Amino acid sequence: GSSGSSGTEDSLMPEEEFLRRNKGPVSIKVQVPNMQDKTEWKLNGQGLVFTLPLTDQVSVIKVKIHEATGMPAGKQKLQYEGIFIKDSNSLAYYNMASGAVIHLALKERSGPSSG
Structure with a gap:
């Protein structure tokens, strides 16, 4: 036996099968930073957790965060294990x-003057 997987995002599974394994719902934790005077949102060293099934896309994750904190559902970049x-x-x-x-x-970008 191999007894040692090589790379997590190497042998990823499809969407159909995946659901078979991760029935869910899953519990994800959103690490919220602490920005006093670095933005116009609600960031005071905290964590937002939401237990939801695997149906919609990551969007549902952004909309929620924005619904609670002033952080818009776009500028914020969600990093999952890198x-x-x-x-x-x-x-x-x-998966x-x-x-x-x-x-x-x-997020890191030149910055859209108008839009």
């Missing part, structure tokens, strides 16, 4: 595992 997950990508696809932890970080 991976830069977006609303375009579905949770199932990635996350219960008790996940989404790290919050500030």
